[PDB]
């Protein structure tokens, strides 16, 4: 009475085959106050299924101490989908990639003894099985699986482990075996899937991800053809442009897949959202997760893409009866034109007329009628006759975005951050350089390295107007070199090269000298074989040269450590622990100073609109509102990349339609109304680089045609 299964044609919910349309929405990348609106917009967008990852490190920050409150209430979210009459594809992982901090693993797991991630490792296996069954049990015990009348029609184990397995060989294959048996062994009564996993054992369905997945078939002829990630654009990286994917192209790619026995297809993302706080975004991943998704980062309709995929869906749902009661038969129409036809014994008949020419329109003749086909398009004919839809004929209105002010300036106070120097009292030292995560345990982005440099009077450069040459190599991702409380300079990396080098002249008077290195991380890596074994922080080499000696290796001497900022230790970001300290009001408030906290109370503007903070006057740091981290800001990181103009037609790659070059990577920083009170709201910014807070404005977001 309540079962979901499959055959060679589709997933089978309660005995019937379904052509399921899905979309991705990650619950922590929005707020619970938004979830109903998103979900409603999704359903009205033509969606039958809501897809989401589970965010393990979000859910178990401490070993033992679990979190499921607020925007991490996973159970709350799914029931909100069920109340909408939509199904859920629950991609549990626990590895999730997702452009999410460390790929979803909690950092503490790294330091469990004997541990190795994503392999045939028994400490990893027990931990993963633990969190997985914990999550399956949770679903079970609120009867959320379709087996029990709930919305979960399938669950995913691991995530795209196939390419990693190829690289690591035998233990990888053992591991995927273990993971599949372990996951189905939880006896969920709905099917399990793995993406990018041809290896996948019965009864698990292997799926694919990509911009296009139409030539995919799964690894047994009795499993159905499922597309778990239709990439609806790309992610934004700090220092990169805003990537876009044209809607005619997404439609063509989906039509192409459905036309050749596509049965299940999920957009990634449908709502991308925001990487709030400092434990969400991954290595160099912008705070904005817009992704050119059908619902934009703020929850608004991204037209025309939203409406165009809505209409695609409508044409599919008209075709669905023919589609579940027949198979795809192809017929040549031309050198780059085909027809894919689903003729049922019953008599239902749907056909897809396609034109793979990326340059020229084409007219074909199909069952006595002509049909024009624009370049790079498919027409859907749910009755083998009427061309109700064509992937390239967009009949929704465009909609430009307007970010319009709502503040125009506020009343700011400033508190300046300690610039620490090495000290004989210092608690936490060692005789060499320590890897950052090992010291901070991802407790803060910031990790001070401090050491003493003895400079005697004999030294030659003291008489002449010379300076000695300091050279600091570090695994990433930002570095500020401080020489006797003097900031000498700042260096930073990229998503593809987070390693950095400072090398320059430093003023060292006679006596003991104080070298202080602040070493910043920008999220942790989330993808790559053994990505969890890459380093952050300074591990050198570190050398001082131009002296009576040749060069002095500062890496073989004593170093002191301070984890995080003093302002963090005083919790200057919260409601309670905010006014513990000496803040500076009025004209004395610091401009263009590095390592500076700011403060301001504001009232919630008028309107329904969603709101962001314009941060273009700022450099880099973290934003907080009423003690809740909006997330990192880095407008000082201007976007690089070849981003010339775009046509929907032709094979899409993610660099094809890029926008926003020469501008801040992210300038507007989404503020959830869900977090504001009508008056008395606390805004706390830690500016890292240097900025002018009097430029910080709120803005209202609105789209018009
Ligand atoms: C699961 C399923 O039926 N898939 C369809 C395929 O069957 C179909 O063609 C298949 O082609 C093979 C060689 O032409 C045959 O060996 C195979 O038996 C045949 N399937 C059937 C049921 O006869 C493809 C063509 O795209 O569509 C799939 O939907
Ligand atoms: O891009 C966001 C989305 O991509 C997926 O990862 C793909 C792919 O599936 C991996 O096998 C491939 O190695 O790299 C790309 C992205 O780096 C992933 O499934 C999602 O979680 C997201 O990262
Ligand atoms: C790892 O962690 C601790 C500090 O928490 C430190 O004592 C230890 O030496 C570190 N080891 C390495 C190899 O970095
Ligand atoms: Cl997802």
Residues ≥6 apart with Cβ < 8 Å to 549 = none
Is residue 52 classed as helix, strand or coil in its secondary structure?
strand
- Pairing mode, if any, of strands 152-157 and 668-671? unpaired
Pocket test for ligand 1, best of 7, 328, 351 (most atoms within 8 A of CB): 328
Q: How far apart are CA 269 and CA 235, in angstroms?
A: 10
For residue 93, the cross-strand partners are 157
Geometric angle at alpha carbon 293, from 290 and 296, rounded to 5°: 55
Q: How far is the CA of 24 from the centre of ligand 4 (A)?
A: 5
Residue 98 near ligand 2, beta carbon < 6 Å: yes
Q: How far apart are the C-alpha atoms of 96 and 53, rounded to whole Å?
A: 7
Q: Are residues 220 and 314 in the same domain?
A: yes
Instruction: Name the residue with tokens 């290195």.
Output: 517
Q: Which of 363, 398, 433 is the last residue of a domain?
A: 398
Closest residue by CA, ligand 2 atom 6: 97
Q: Looking at the CA of residue 435, tell me the nearest atom of ligand 3.
A: 14
Chain mean position to CA 678: 31
Residues 30 and 49 in one domain: yes
Q: Nearest 5°: CA angle at 69, between 68 and 75? A: 55
Ligand 3 midpoint to CA 558 (Å):
14
**CA of 222, closest atom in ligand 1:** 1
Helix (H) or strand (E) run with residue 443 in it: none
Evaluate whether 447 touches 563 at the Cβ level (below 8 Å). yes
Cβ of 395 closer than 6 Å to ligand 3, yes or no, is no
Q: What are the structure tokens assigned to 264, written together?
A: 């299940």
Report helix angle 74-83 to 122-140, nearest 10.
Answer: 40
Distance, C-alpha 14 to centroid of its chain = 34
Is the domain of 606 the same as that of 636? Answer: yes
What atom in ligand 3 is closest to the CA of residue 434?
14
The answer to whether residues 459 and 592 belong to one domain is no
Resolution (angstroms) stands at: 2.8
Is residue 259 lining ligand 1, measured as CB closer than 6 Å?
Answer: no
Ligand 3 mutation pick, 438, 443, 562, max ligand atoms within 8 A of CB = 438
How far, in Å, is the centroid of ligand 1 from the Cα of 216?
14
Q: Ligand 3: which of 434, 436, 536 to mutate, judged by most atoms within 8 Å of the beta carbon?
A: 434
Rounded CA separation 31/19 (Å): 30
- Cα angle value 412/418/419 (rounded, 5°): 125
Expressed in angstroms and rounded, the spacing between residue 629 Cα and the centre of ligand 2 is 26
- Give the distance (Å) from ligand 3 centre to CA of residue 438: 6
| Residues 201 and 180 both lie in one domain | yes
Pocket test for ligand 2, best of 229, 237, 524, 529 (most atoms within 8 A of CB): 229
Instruction: Find the 91 Cα to ligand 1 centroid distance in Å.
Output: 29
- CA-nearest residue for atom 14, ligand 2, is 527
Nearest CA to 281 among 494, 99, 57? 99
Mutating to test ligand 2, I would choose from 523, 527, 529, 653 the residue with most ligand atoms within 8 A of its C-beta, which is 527
Residue of 37, 12, 15 whose CA lies nearest to 25: 37
The closest alpha carbon to 450, from 478, 481, 476, belongs to 481
Report whether residue 438 contacts ligand 3, using a CB cutoff of 6 Å.
yes
CA neighbor of 17 nearest in space, from 166, 169, 225, 197:
225
Q: Which conformational region is residue 682 in: left (phi greater than 0), alpha (psi within -120 to 50 degrees), or beta? A: beta
Q: What is the spatial distance between Cα 595 and Cα 414, in angstroms, rounded to a whole number?
A: 11
The answer to whether the Cα torsion of 436, 439, 441, 442 is positive or negative is negative
For residue 561, the Cα-to-chain-centroid distance in whole angstroms is: 31
Choosing from 327, 345, 352, 354 the residue with most ligand 1 atoms within 8 A of its CB, the one to mutate for a pocket test is: 327
Contact 383, 366 (CB under 8 A): no
Its domain, for residue 232, covers 1-398
98 C-alpha to ligand 2 centroid (Å): 7
334 contacts: CB under 8 Å, gap ≥ 6:
362, 364
Structure token pair of residue 232: 């609806």
CB 521 within 8 A of CB 534: no
Indicate if the alpha-carbon torsion angle 63, 69, 71, 73 is positive or negative.
positive
Q: Do 340 and 455 fall into the same domain?
A: no
Q: For the chain, how many helices (H) and strands (E)?
A: 10, 40
Alpha carbon distance 575, 680 (integer Å) = 11
Structural contact between residues 670 and 700, judged by C-beta atoms closer than 8 angstroms: no
Among residues 295, 335, 279, the alpha carbon closest in space to that of 106 is found at 279
Backbone angles phi, psi at 400, to 5 degrees: -75, 150
Q: Which residue in the block uniquely carries the two structure tokens 């030539």?
A: 215
Instruction: Mark whether 592 and 524 lie in a shared domain.
Output: no
What's the gap in Å between 160 CA and the centre of ligand 2?
A: 7
Residue 474 C-alpha to ligand 3 middle, in angstroms? 17
Phi/psi for 683 (5° steps) reads -110, 120
Answer yes or no: is the C-beta of 261 below 6 A from any ligand 1 atom.
yes
Rounded distance between C-alpha atoms, residue 114 and residue 195, angstroms: 28
Element (H, E) at 191: none
Helix (H, G, I), strand (E, B) or coil at 358: coil
- Do residues 191 and 4 touch, judged by C-beta distance below 8 A? yes
Q: Where are the beta strands (DSSP E) in 493-627?
A: 500-505, 511-520, 542-545, 551-553, 559-563, 584-585, 596-602, 611-614, 621-625
Instruction: Identify the residue whose C-alpha is closest to ligand 1 atom 19.
Output: 327
DSSP string across 610-659: -EEEE-TT--SEEEEETTEEEEEE-TTSBPPS------SSS---TTSEEE
Which residues have CB atoms below 5 A from the ion given as ligand 4?
A: 24, 51, 53
Q: Measured between alpha carbons, how far is 695 from 452 in angstroms, rounded to an integer?
A: 39
Phi, psi values for residue 693, rounded to 5°: -55, -25
Q: If we measure between CA atoms, which residue out of 148, 133, 224 comes closest to residue 179?
A: 133
In short, whether 426's Cβ falls inside 6 Å of ligand 3 is no
Residue 448, strand partner residues: 518, 562
Least distant ligand from the CA of 441: 3
Both 355 and 207 in a single domain?
A: yes
Q: Ligand 1 mean position to 536 CA, how many Å? A: 51
Burial class (CB in 10 A: 0-12, 13-18, 19+), 681: middle
| Ligand 2 proximity of 4 Cβ (cutoff 6 Å) | no
302 lines ligand 2 (CB under 6 A): no
DSSP 381-426: ETTSS---EETT---S---EEEEEES-S----EEEE-------TT-
Q: In sequence order, what are the beta bridge partners of 474?
A: 500
Which of residues 547, 563, 579 is at a domain's end? 563
Last residue of a domain, one of 515, 546, 563: 563
CA atoms of 274 and 630, how far apart (whole Å): 9
User: What technique was this entry resolved by?
Assistant: X-ray
Q: How far is the CA of 163 from the centre of ligand 1 (A)?
A: 28
Residue with tokens 């407008």: 635
Pocket of ligand 3 contains residue 446 by CB under 6 Å: no
User: DSSP 3-state helix, strand, coil percentages of the chain (rounded to 5)?
Assistant: 20, 30, 45
What is the DSSP track for 239-302? TS-EEE--HHHHHHHHHHHHHTTEEEEEEEEEE--B--TTSSB-TTB-SB--TT-SB-TTS-B-
Q: In terms of residues, how long is the chain? A: 705
Query: Half-sphere exposure of residue 53, counting CA atoms within 13 Å on the CB side?
Result: 29
CA angle 567, 568, 573 (to 5 degrees): 85
- Tell whether 295 and 439 lie within a shared domain: no
What secondary structure letter does DSSP report for 334? E
What's the CA-to-centroid distance between 223 and ligand 1, angstroms? 13
Cβ–ligand 1 distance for 328 under 6 Å, the answer yes
User: Which atom of ligand 3 approaches the CA of 441 most closely?
Assistant: 5
CA of 328 from ligand 1 middle (Å) equals: 7
76 with 218, same domain? yes
CA of 463 to the centre of ligand 2 (A): 58
Contact at 8 Å (CB) between 602 and 677? no
Same domain, 551 and 632: no
Cα 575 to middle of ligand 1, angstroms:
63
Alpha helices in 5-87 (DSSP H): 35-44, 56-59, 74-83
Report the domain count for the chain.
3
Interior CA angle at 564 toward 559 and 568, to 5°? Answer: 145
Atom of ligand 1 nearest to the CA of 340: 26
> Are 68 and 92 found together in one domain?
yes
Closest residue by CA, ligand 2 atom 21: 98
Structure tokens, 242: 């805003």
């Amino acid at each position: 009475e309540f079962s979901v299964s499959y055959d060679d044609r589709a997933i089978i919910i309660n005995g019937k085959r379904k052509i399921l349309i899905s979309g991705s929405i990650h619950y922590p990348r929005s707020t619970p106050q938004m979830w109903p609106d998103l979900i409603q917009k999704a359903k009205d967008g033509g969606l039958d299924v809501i897809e989401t990852y589970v965010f393990w490190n979000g859910h178990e920050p401490s070993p033992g101490k679990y979190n499921f409150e607020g925007r991490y209430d996973l159970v709350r979210f799914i029931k909100m989908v069920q109340r909408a009459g939509l199904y859920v594809n629950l991609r549990i992982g626990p590895y999730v990639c997702a452009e999410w901090n460390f790929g979803g693993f909690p950092v503490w797991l790294k330091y469990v003894p004997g541990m190795e991630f994503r392999t045939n490792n028994q400490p990893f296996k027990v931990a993963m099985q633990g969190f997985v069954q914990k999550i399956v049990n949770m679903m079970k015990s609120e009867n959320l699986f379709e087996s029990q009348g709930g919305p979960i029609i399938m669950a995913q184990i691991e995530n795209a482990y196939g390419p990693v397995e190829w690289e690591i060989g035998a233990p990888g294959k053992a591991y995927t075996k273990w993971a599949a048996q372990m996951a189905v062994g939880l006896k969920t009564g709905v099917p399990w899937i793995m993406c990018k996993q041809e290896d996948a054992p019965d009864p698990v369905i292997d799926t694919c991800n990509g911009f296009y997945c139409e030539g995919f078939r799964p690894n047994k002829p009795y499993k159905p053809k499922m597309w778990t990630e239709v990439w609806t654009g790309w992610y934004t990286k700090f220092g990169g442009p805003i990537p876009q994917r044209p809607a005619e192209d997404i439609a063509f790619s989906v039509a192409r897949f459905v036309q050749n026995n596509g049965s299940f297809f999920n957009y990634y993302m449908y709502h991308g959202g925001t990487n709030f706080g400092r434990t969400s975004s991954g290595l160099f991943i912008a705070t904005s997760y817009d992704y050119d998704a059908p619902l934009d980062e703020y929850g608004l309709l991204n037209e025309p893409k939203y409406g165009h995929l809505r209409d695609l869906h409508k044409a599919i749902k008209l075709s669905e009866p023919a589609l579940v009661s027949s198979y795809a038969a192809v017929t040549s129409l031309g050198s780059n034109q085909e027809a894919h036809v689903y003729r049922s014994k019953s008599g239902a008949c749907a056909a897809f007329l396609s034109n793979y020419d990326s340059r020229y329109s084409v007219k074909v003749t199909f069952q006595n009628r002509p049909y024009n086909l624009p370049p790079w398009s498919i027409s859907i004919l749910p009755d083998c006759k009427t061309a109700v839809y064509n992937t390239a004929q967009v009949n929704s209105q465009s909609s430009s975005i307007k970010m319009t002010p709502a503040g125009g300036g506020l009343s700011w106070q400033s508190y300046n951050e300690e610039t620490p120097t090495a000290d004989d009292s210092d608690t936490l030292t060692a005789n060499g350089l320590w890897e950052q995560k090992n010291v901070t345990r991802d407790s803060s982005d910031y990790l001070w390295y401090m050491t003493n440099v003895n400079i005697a009077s004999n030294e030659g450069f003291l008489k002449n107007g010379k300076d000695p040459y300091l050279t600091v190599m570090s695994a990433g991702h930002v570095l500020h070199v401080f020489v006797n409380g003097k900031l000498s300079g700042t260096v930073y990396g990229t998503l593809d090269n987070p390693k950095l080098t400072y090398s320059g002249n430093v003023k060292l008077r006679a006596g003991i000298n104080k070298i202080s290195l602040l070493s910043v991380s920008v999220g942790l890596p989330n993808v790559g074989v053994h990505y969890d074994t890459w380093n952050a922080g300074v591990l050198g080499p570190v050398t001082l040269s131009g002296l009576n000696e040749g060069s002095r290796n500062l890496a073989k001497q004593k170093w002191s450590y301070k984890v995080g900022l003093k302002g963090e230790s005083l919790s200057l970001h919260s409601l309670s622990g905010s006014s513990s300290v000496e803040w500076v009001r009025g004209s004395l408030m610091a401009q263009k100073q590095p390592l500076t906290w700011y403060k301001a109370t504001f009232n919630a503007p008028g309107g329904n609109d969603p709101l962001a903070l314009d941060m273009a006057s700022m450099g880099k740091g973290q934003i907080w509102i009423n003690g809740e981290g909006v997330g990192r800001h880095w407008p000082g990181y201007i976007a690089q990349g070849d981003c010339s103009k775009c046509s929907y037609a032709g094979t899409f790659n993610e660099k094809k339609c890029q926008t926003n070059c020469g501008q801040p990577s992210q300038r507007w920083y989404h503020v959830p109304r869900s977090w504001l009170k009508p008056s008395g709201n606390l805004l706390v910014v830690f500016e890292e680089w240097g900025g002018n807070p009097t430029g910080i404005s709120l803005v209202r977001r609105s789209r018009s045609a």
